[PDB]
Amino acid sequence: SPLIGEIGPETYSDYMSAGIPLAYIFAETAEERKELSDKLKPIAEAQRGVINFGTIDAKAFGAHAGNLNLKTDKFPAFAIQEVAKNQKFPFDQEKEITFEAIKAFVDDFVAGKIEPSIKSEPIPEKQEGPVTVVVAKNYNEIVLDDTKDVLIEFYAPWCGHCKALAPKYEELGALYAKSEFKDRVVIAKVDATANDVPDEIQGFPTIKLYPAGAKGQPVTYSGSRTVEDLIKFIAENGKYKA
């Protein structure tokens, strides 16, 4: 077979089972797949036996990008999968894919210089709006902040009751941002479909209170989902009985 093969249904399990890492090159047309194949060939050459490289059809399989912690719908892209440890190593998708760039990345991977990825939207540069936006990369900082009573909503964009709940959650945040409790209570949400989080979720929405000092016994709301019942909830279960 060709040095840089063709990652798809027939070849995948062979790729997985080979027991070495796999490097995906994502692209929407055959024409671009080739360009890049050739562009990267000398690196694949170097890494024989140590890393498999392959081309993947981003039209037919773009969805698989998310499995590598690459953004859906931003091609062409590149990422390396450590099969054994089940670790993902995406290559920034805003950066251009060039021999010199990839080679550095790869060398750094092989060097064990890169930290394994995580599903996260990027940390927002500003936290404006009354509801704090949690993404995977600040869940700890914000949700597990031991000094704050944290209310967190776990949502899915595509869920109906979540969108129904949205305005009232917004209202509940604006209310606490304007109260005497502003410094110690947090009203936050996270898109659980876009971010890896700790909590095991079963349906959307889900609301939990992580109280200050008891971030091991978070509390699952199962009330009416009205602004006042959720205030009652934070007061009744929060350290600061707000």
Swiss-Prot record:
Residues annotated as site: Contributes to redox potential value: 160-161
Catalytic-site annotation from UniProt: 159 (nucleophile), 162 (nucleophile)
Feature type site, description Lowers pKa of C-terminal Cys of second active site: 225
Disulphide bond pairs: 159-162
Organism superkingdom: Eukaryota
Subcellular location: Endoplasmic reticulum lumen
Domain Thioredoxin: residue ranges: 109-239
Function field: Participates in the folding of proteins containing disulfide bonds, may be involved in glycosylation, prolyl hydroxylation and triglyceride transfer.
Family stated for the protein in its record: Belongs to the protein disulfide isomerase family.
Protein name, entry field: Protein disulfide-isomerase
Source species of the chain: Humicola insolens (Soft-rot fungus)
